[PDB]
C-alpha cells in the first residue's frame, strides 16, 4: 500500500526563459525554468568543449513554475524573480551570496475560494508580467483577478482588481502585457467579450478586443483608457513593442496587427483564410503565406521582431517606420529554421535562446548580411529528453565478455523523445558500462599509479605490493620490468609526476627517488621517526606527511632539476590527519598564473587552507567533519579519511571539495564570496551538494582525479558503490554510478597505443582491467544518453527481443489535398481547390521503422508504410502462443492502426501484427539481415486503439469493445469480448488480468478464463478519471494499479472485495495518492536489487523529460520515514517558500501513502549535528534512518 517516490532523472526541458541579473547587477544571466526546476546559465565565448552555455546554479522547487518575471527592486544589488505556481501562488525569490541557495522575499497565496467566483476547475494559468520601469507587477489570477504588486522593506501590500467589474466586461482574457512609454503602468489586455470558435464564423465574425488599463498605484484606481473592439476572432498572444515606436503587435492566427493609441489600426493578412472570417481592414502582405498561432517572439532593439513560428521557422519581422515614428508597412524575411520552441530570449546582442520542451533548446547567433537580413547559426544546444511519449527497456549490444556471466540484468531504455522536426529516440542508460579491452590477474598489489615517460602517453604502470613494487613498461605490448631505477624491494605509498612530466617521483616510506624514466638522478632519505603514510603533489611542490602527523615540503630547483628539503612553519597544536594540494590555473582563491594551495585537516575538528609558497593561514573552518551545508571561515568528532580539492570545468575553473568522513560522502562546491576581514583570507565559501552515494560495505585513496578520459575531466570515486564525477564545459556536476565489476578498489587513467584514452582499475578480486568508455553515448546529460534524430514524430517504440531490434512508429507531415465525403455509395474525395495565398492542412502519413541496436542507424528495406489516412494508435511487443518453438510464446511486434478522415467518415481500423525475421544480408549491408514479415494485416470493424497480450492471446480494443483474438496460422479467430467504456487508449495486462484505461471514464480490471471462453468485468473505477496511462504496482502478494492522470497525479488502486467501503468486489479503491510534477505516459516494472524478495520498482518517464519511480515498502519502514518527512516538511527553509506536503497532495479524500524521496533526500543533506536533532524529535537515532534511506537507494540503481 505504501511507497516511496524517488526521482531518478531531473526534468529536462524549458517552458520559461528570461535574461536577468540573477547573481549581481554586473552580468546578466540566462535564468530558464522548466517544470519544477530553475536553471541559471552563464555565457562562455572562449570554451574548449566557441560559445557555450555554462550552468551556474540550478534549483528545485516543490511546485511547477507557471510563469516567471524579473524586476530590479529599489536599491537591490540583484534581480528578484517573480515565480508563479499552480492555483495562484506568487513567490518573489533572490539568489543570496553567503549561502549559495535562493532566498524567498515574499509569499503571496491567492487560493481563496471567493477569488474563483465558483469556478472550481481552474483552466487559466496565473501569468506574471512586470512593468519595464519597475513600478509594479501584475499577476492574472484565475483569468478574472488582476493582482497588482506595487513596488517602492522593498515592497508594498498587494490588491486584487476585479476584471469582470471593469468597463467593457472583459470576461475572457487571452493575453496581457505592460506597454512601453507612459507615466503609469499601463497594461494592455486582449480579451473576447462574446466568445467564438474557429469553426463557427458565420454568426460571430470577429470578437477580440483590447483594453489598455492604466494602473494608479497610490490612489488604487484604474482608468480604462484606449479600447478597440472588432479585432479578428482568433487572436493569439499580444506583445508590447518597445519605447522608440511604442504600441503593440497582436498575433492573430491568420493576420498580424500593429495597434497604438494615436495611430489608426494597421494590420496585414498572411493567407487567404481571412476572406470570410474577418471584417477588420486587412491589407495583403506580398510574398508571404504563413500562420501565427503558436509563435513565440522577442524584439531586437527597435523595429525588428524574431518570430519563431509553429514548425520552428524563424521569421524576422521588420516594422517599416515613417519619419513620424509610425508604422507604415511590414517586412518579412524567411530566415533559418530551428527548434520547435516554447519560449524565446534575447541574450547579449547577437545571441538568441529558443527554450523548448520538445527538442534540444538551443542558443543561436544572428549576424548582419552584406534591408538588414539576418542569418542564423547554432552555437550550443541544451540537451533535452523531450516529452517521452513511449519508452521501452532494451538490452545493449556491446557488453564486454568479462561482464557476461553477471547475475543482474544489464539493460537500457530507449525513449521516444521530442516531436515533429525535433522528434527523436534517446538511449538512456543510468550506469556506466566500460569496454574491457585487456584483463590481467595480478594478485598481491593493492594500489596503482601511472606516470608519463618519453603527445602524452602513460609510460609506466606502478603497482605496490605488500613487500615489493612492480614496474610495467608500456608501449606496443606491456611487460614487467626488472632493471634498476625504481625501488622494487619495498612498497610505495605514492608515485606521480613533477615539473611538467619531465621527472617521475615515487614515495618510499624511507625516502623519495627522482626518476627520468628508467634512470635515477639521486635519492633523498626521509629521516622522520614515523613512516610516510601518504603524500600529495603540485607541479614544483612535493608535500610529505608522516604517520605521526609530521609534514615536510619538497621543491624543484633548476641546475637538471632536484628536490630540496623545506620545513614548513606549522603550529602543531593537534595532529594532522590528512592532506590535499591544489593549484589555480583558473583561480577564484584570491586572498586579495598558478597559485598553489595547501589544504590541511587537524584532529581537533578544524580545517586549514594555506597558500603554498608561504605557509600562512588563509581559511579556517572550526568544526569541519560535521558536514555543515556552508563552510564559512573563522580566521566525538568523526574521523576524516581523505580530502580532495580538484578543479573541474572549462580550463580548470571551478573547484570542488571531496572529503571522506567515516562511511559518508559529502562534497562541496566552491563559489566566490567577498568577505570584509581585511587581513587576507579566502574570498570563497563551500556549498554542500546532494548525493545518492554511500561508502558502506600505506593509505589507499578513494578519490582519483582524471583528466582527458574520453574528453572528460573529473573524479572517479572508488569504493563499495563506485561513482564518476563528470563536469564538462557545461559546468554541471554529473554522478554516474558503475555497478558492474562490483566494488572497485583503485583506478588510474590509461592512455596507450593499442588502447585509446580510457582507464584502468582493479576488481575487488584482484583483476587488473584495461578499459575504454563506450564511445556512442554522451555522458554530459544527467543520465548517459545518445540522441537519435528521426526528424519525424516517434509515437511508440518496441524492443523486439528475438533478433534484438527496435520498432518505431513515426509520422511526417504531408500537406493535405483531399476531403473525404461519404455520400451514400462509397467514399468521395473532394480535391482542395483554393487560392495561391493559402496554407494547407497537415496530413500525417505513418510508417513503422526498424532501428538497430548495434549501430543506431535504421534498417533499409524494413519500413512498413501504412495507408493514406491511417494513424497508428499503438505499437507494442506482443507474445502470442505458437507450436513452433520449444516454448509456447513467440514475441511478435503487433501494431494497431486506424484511419482518421474527420468526424463525417466512419473511422475503421486494422491490426498490423508484424515479425522481425533474420534473413541473409545483402553483401555490403550487414544491417539488412533484419526484415519484417507481416503475418496479419486485415481491416477490422472499427478503430484499433490499444493492444495487450494475455497467455498468448491478443487483446485488442475496437470501438466500445475490447477483443480477444488468437493467432492461428494466418487468420485471427475471435474468442472473447466485452462492451467496454468510451475510448480505451491504454491496456496492459499480466496473468489474465486486463487493465484498461479510458480517456475520460474509468480504468477497469478484466479477467479471462480459458476453460470457458469468456472475458468479463471484475472491477472498474466508478468515478470519472482522465487517465493518461496505467501500470502494475507489484507487492509481495498485493497488486496495485498505478494510474497516472491528466492533472499530473499518480495513484495506486487495489481490488479489495472484503472491504466494505466499495461494493462487494465491484469498485476499485485508491490506496495511495501522490502528485508528480509532470504528466506521465510511460510505465514499466523491474525487480529491485527476507525483504525485497518479491517487490517491483514500477518506474516511469514523465512527459517533461524526467524519470521517476515508485518503490513499494512495508508499514514499519514507511512510518519511520513519515515521522521524518513531517519533521522535514516543517523545520526546513524550502525553496521559494513552498510547502512540500501540500504540493504532493492529490489535487482533486487525498489518501496519500507515498513518500517523497526528494524531500527525504534532504535528510541526507543535513549536517550530522542537525541530523541527530530531527532523529531525537521523532524518537530514533540517525543510524536507523540511514539504514532506511540508503536501502531505498541501493535497490533502485538499475539501467
Amino acid at each position: 500500500m505504501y511507497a516511496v517516490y524517488k526521482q531518478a532523472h531531473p526534468p529536462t526541458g524549458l517552458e520559461f526563459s528570461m535574461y536577468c541579473n540573477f547573481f549581481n547587477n554586473s552580468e546578466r544571466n540566462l535564468v530558464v525554468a522548466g517544470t519544477s526546476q530553475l536553471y541559471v546559465y552563464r555565457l562562455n565565448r572562449d570554451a574548449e568543449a566557441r560559445e557555450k552555455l555554462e550552468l551556474a546554479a540550478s534549483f528545485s522547487f516543490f511546485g511547477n513554475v507557471m510563469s516567471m518575471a524579473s524586476v530590479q527592486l529599489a536599491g537591490a544589488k540583484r534581480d528578484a524573480l517573480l515565480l508563479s505556481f499552480k492555483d495562484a501562488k506568487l513567490s518573489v525569490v533572490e539568489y543570496d551570496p553567503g549561502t549559495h541557495d535562493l532566498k524567498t522575499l515574499s509569499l503571496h497565496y491567492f487560493e481563496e475560494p471567493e477569488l474563483r467566483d465558483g469556478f472550481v476547475q481552474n483552466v487559466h494559468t496565473p501569468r506574471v508580467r512586470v512593468d519595464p520601469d519597475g513600478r509594479c507587477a501584475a499577476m492574472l489570477v484565475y483569468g478574472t483577478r488582476l493582482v497588482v504588486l506595487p513596488f517602492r522593506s522593498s515592497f508594498l501590500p498587494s490588491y486584487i482588481i476585479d476584471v469582470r467589474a471593469l468597463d467593457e466586461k472583459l470576461l475572457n482574457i487571452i493575453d496581457l502585457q505592460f506597454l512601453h512609454g507612459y507615466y503609469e503602468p499601463t497594461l494592455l489586455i486582449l480579451f473576447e467579450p462574446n466568445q467564438t470558435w474557429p469553426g463557427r464564423v458565420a454568426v460571430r465574425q470577429d470578437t477580440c478586443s483590447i483594453v489598455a488599463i492604466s494602473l494608479n498605484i497610490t490612489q488604487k484606481v484604474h482608468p480604462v483608457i484606449w479600447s478597440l473592439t472588432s479585432l479578428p476572432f482568433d487572436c493569439t498572444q499580444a506583445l508590447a513593442v518597445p519605447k522608440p515606436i511604442g504600441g503593440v503587435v497582436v498575433f492573430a492566427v491568420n493576420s498580424l496587427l500593429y495597434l497604438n493609441q494615436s495611430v489608426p489600426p494597421y494590420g496585414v493578412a498572411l493567407n487567404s483564410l481571412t476572406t470570410g472570417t474577418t471584417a477588420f481592414p486587412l491589407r495583403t502582405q506580398e510574398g508571404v503565406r504563413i500562420t501565427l498561432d503558436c509563435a513565440q517572439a522577442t524584439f531586437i532593439s527597435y523595429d525588428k521582431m524574431v518570430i519563431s513560428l509553429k514548425g520552428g521557422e524563424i521569421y524576422v519581422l521588420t516594422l517599416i517606420t515613417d519619419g513620424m515614428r509610425s508604422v507604415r508597412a511590414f517586412h518579412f524575411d524567411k530566415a533559418a529554421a530551428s527548434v520547435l520552441t516554447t519560449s524565446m530570449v534575447t541574450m547579449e546582442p547577437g545571441y538568441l535562446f529558443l527554450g523548448s520542451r520538445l527538442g534540444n533548446s538551443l542558443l543561436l547567433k544572428y549576424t548582419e548580411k552584406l534591408l538588414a537580413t539576418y542569418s542564423f547559426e547554432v552555437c550550443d544546444s541544451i540537451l533535452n529528453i523531450g516529452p517521452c511519449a513511449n519508452a521501452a527497456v532494451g538490452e545493449p549490444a556491446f557488453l564486454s565478455e568479462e561482464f557476461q556471466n553477471s547475475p543482474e540484468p544489464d539493460l537500457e531504455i530507449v525513449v521516444c523523445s521530442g516531436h515533429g522536426k525535433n522528434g527523436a529516440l534517446s538511449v538512456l542508460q543510468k550506469s556506466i558500462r566500460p569496454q574491457v579491452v585487456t584483463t590481467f590477474e595480478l594478485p598481491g598489489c593493492y594500489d596503482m599509479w601511472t606516470v608519463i615517460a618519453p603527445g602524452r602517453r602513460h609510460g609506466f604502470l606502478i603497482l605496490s605490493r605488500e613487500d615489493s613494487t612492480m614496474i610495467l613498461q608500456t608501449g606496443q605490448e606491456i611487460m614487467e620490468l626488472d632493471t634498476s631505477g625504481f625501488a622494487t624491494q619495498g612498497p610505495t605509498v605514492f608515485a606521480g609526476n613533477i615539473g611538467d612530466n619531465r621527472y617521475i617521483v615515487q614515495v618510499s616510506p624511507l625516502g623519495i627517488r627522482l626518476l627520468e624514466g628508467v634512470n635515477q638522478l639521486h635519492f633523498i632519505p626521509v629521516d622522520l621517526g614515523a613512516p610516510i603514510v601518504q603524500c600529495a603533489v603540485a607541479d614544483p611542490y612535493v608535500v610529505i606527511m608522516s604517520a605521526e602527523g609530521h609534514v615536510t615540503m619538497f621543491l624543484l630547483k633548476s641546475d637538471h632539476h632536484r628536490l630540496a628539503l623545506h620545513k614548513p612553519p606549522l603550529h602543531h597544536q593537534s595532529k594532522v590527519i590528512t592532506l590535499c594540494l591544489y593549484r589555480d590555473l583558473s583561480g577564484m582563491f584570491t586572498t586579495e598564473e598558478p597559485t598553489h594551495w595547501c589544504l590541511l585537516v587537524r584532529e581537533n575538528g578544524t580545517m586549514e587552507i594555506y597558500q603554498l609558497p608561504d605557509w600562512r593561514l588563509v581559511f579556517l573552518v572550526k568544526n569541519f567533519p560535521v558536514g555543515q551545508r556552508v563552510l564559512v571561515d573563522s580566521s566525538e568528532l568523526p574521523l576524516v579519511k581523505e580530502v580532495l580539492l580538484v578543479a573541474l570545468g572549462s580550463r580548470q575553473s571551478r573547484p570542488y571539495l571531496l572529503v571522506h568522513v567515516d562511511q559518508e560522502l559529502l562534497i562541496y562546491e566552491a563559489f566566490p564570496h567577498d568577505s570584509q576581514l581585511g587581513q587576507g583570507n579566502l574570498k570563497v565559501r563551500f556549498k554542500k551538494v546532494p548525493h545518492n552515494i554511500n561508502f558502506r560495505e600505506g593509505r589507499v585513496a578513494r578519490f582519483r582525479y582524471f583528466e582527458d578520459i574520453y574528453g572528460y575531466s573529473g573524479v572517479f570515486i572508488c569504493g563499495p558503490s563506485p561513482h564518476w564525477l563528470l563536469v564538462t564545459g557545461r559546468g554541471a556536476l554529473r554522478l554516474h554510478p558503475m555497478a558492474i565489476d562490483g566494488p572497485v578498489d583503485s583506478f588510474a587513467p590509461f592512455h596507450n597505443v593499442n588502447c585509446p584514452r580510457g582507464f584502468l582499475y582493479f576488481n575487488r578480486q584482484g583483476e587488473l582491467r584495461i578499459s575504454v568508455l563506450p564511445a556512442y553515448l554522451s555522458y554530459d546529460a544527467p543520465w548517459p544518453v545518445r540522441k537519435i534524430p528521426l526528424r519525424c514524430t516517434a509515437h511508440y517504440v518496441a524492443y523486439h527481443v528475438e533478433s534484438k531490434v527496435y520498432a518505431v512508429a513515426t509520422s511526417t507531415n504531408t500537406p493535405c489535398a483531399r476531403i473525404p465525403r461519404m455520400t451514400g455509395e462509397e467514399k468521395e474525395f473532394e480535391t482542395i481547390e483554393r487560392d495561391e495565398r493559402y496554407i494547407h492542412p497537415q496530413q500525417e502519413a505513418f510508417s513503422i521503422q526498424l532501428i538497430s541496436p548495434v549501430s543506431w542507424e535504421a534498417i533499409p528495406n524494413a519500413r512498413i508504410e501504412l495507408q493514406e489516412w491511417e494513424h497508428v494508435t499503438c505499437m507494442k511487443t506482443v507474445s502470442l502462443r505458437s507450436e513452433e518453438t520449444v516454448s509456447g510464446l513467440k514475441g511478435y511486434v503487433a501494431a494497431g492502426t486506424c484511419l482518421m478522415q474527420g468526424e463525417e467518415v466512419t473511422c475503421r481500423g486494422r491490426i498490423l501484427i508484424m515479425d522481425v525475421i533474420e534473413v541473409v544480408p545483402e553483401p555490403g549491408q550487414p544491417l539488412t539481415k533484419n526484415k519484417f514479415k507481416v503475418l496479419y494485416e486485415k481491416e477490422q470493424k472499427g478503430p484499433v486503439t490499444a493492444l495487450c497480450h494475455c497467455n498468448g492471446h491478443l487483446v485488442s480494443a475496437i470501438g466500445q469493445k475490447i477483443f480477444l483474438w488468437s493467432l492461428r496460422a494466418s487468420e485471427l479467430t475471435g474468442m472473447a469480448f466485452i462492451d467496454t467504456q468510451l475510448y480505451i487508449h491504454q491496456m496492459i495486462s499480466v496473468k489474465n488480468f486486463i487493465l484498461a484505461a479510458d480517456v475520460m471514464k474509468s480504468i477497469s480490471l478484466l479477467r479471462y478464463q480459458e476453460e470457458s471462453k469468456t472475458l468479463s468485468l471484475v472491477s472498474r473505477d466508478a468515478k470519472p478519471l482522465e487517465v493518461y496511462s496505467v501500470d502494475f504496482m507489484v507487492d509481495n502478494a498485493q497488486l496495485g494499479f498505478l494510474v497516472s492522470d491528466r492533472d499530473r497525479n499518480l495513484m495506486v488502486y487495489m481490488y479489495l472485495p472484503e472491504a466494505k467501503e466499495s461494493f462487494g468486489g465491484m469498485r476499485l479503491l485508491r490506496r495511495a495518492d501522490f502528485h508528480v510534477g509532470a504528466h506521465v505516459n510511460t510505465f514499466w516494472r523491474t525487480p529491485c536489487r527476507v525483504v525485497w524478495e518479491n517487490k517491483h520498482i514500477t518506474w516511469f518517464a514523465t512527459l517533461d523529460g524526467g524519470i521517476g519511480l515508485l518503490l513499494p515498502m512495508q508499514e514499519k519502514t514507511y512510518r519511520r520515514l513519515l515521522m521524518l518527512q513531517n519533521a522535514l516538511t516543517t523545520m526546513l527553509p524550502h525553496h521559494a517558500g513552498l510547502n512540500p506536503r501540500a504540493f504532493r497532495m492529490l489535487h482533486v479524500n487525498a489518501v496519500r501513502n507515498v513518500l517523497d524521496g526528494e524531500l527525504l533526500n534532504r535528510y541526507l543533506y543535513l549536517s550530522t549535528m542537525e541530523r541527530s536533532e530531527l532523529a531525537k524529535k521523532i524518537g530514533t537515532t540517525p543510524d536507523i534512518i540511514l539504514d532506511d534511506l540508503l536501502e531505498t537507494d541501493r535497490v533502485t540503481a538499475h539501467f
Binding site: 480477444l964 475471435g974 496473468k991 478464463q1009 471462453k1013 507489484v1034
Partner: protein, 116 residues
C-alpha cells in the same frame, strides 16, 4: 517484453486468490436480473454451487448450438434462461434471414451464415 525481467508467474497474488473462491461476492439483488458482465462460477461446474437463481456469476447448460444474435449488441434480457449461446465463436451463428429466404444479401460485411 516485460516477462524476461519483471516476471510474476511464480507469484500467487492476493488478486488471484480473490477470484477463485470469489472472495465474498454478494448474492445479487432483484431476482429478475441477467448476470451480465459476469464470467462463470467454478462452484457449479465441479459440484453443487450453493445458491440458486440469486447468484452473481453465470450458470451454463448444454445443448446450445446457436449463438445469440441480440447478445452481440449488448441486449440480453434472458440471461441464463437463454436458449442460445453466449460465446464469440464465429461458427455457431444463425442462418442469415435474407440470404436463406430472400435470395442474396444486402450489406457487404454480414456476419451471419450464408449456406447453399
Amino acid at each position: 517484453m516485460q516477462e524476461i525481467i519483471a516476471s510474476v508467474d511464480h507469484i500467487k497474488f492476493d488478486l488471484e486468490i480473490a477470484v477463485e473462491q470469489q472472495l465474498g461476492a454478494q448474492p445479487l439483488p432483484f431476482p429478475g436480473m441477467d448476470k451480465s458482465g459476469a464470467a462463470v462460477c467454478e462452484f457449479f461446474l465441479k459440484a453443487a454451487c450453493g445458491k440458486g437463481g440469486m447468484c452473481p456469476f453465470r450458470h451454463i447448460s448444454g445443448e446450445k448450438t446457436v449463438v445469440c444474435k441480440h447478445w452481440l449488441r449488448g441486449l440480453c434480457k434472458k440471461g441464463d434462461q437463454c436458449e442460445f449461446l453466449h460465446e464469440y465463436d464465429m461458427t455457431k451463428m444463425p442462418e442469415c434471414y435474407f440470404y436463406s429466404k430472400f435470395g442474396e444479401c444486402s450489406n457487404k460485411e454480414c456476419p451471419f451464415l450464408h449456406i447453399d
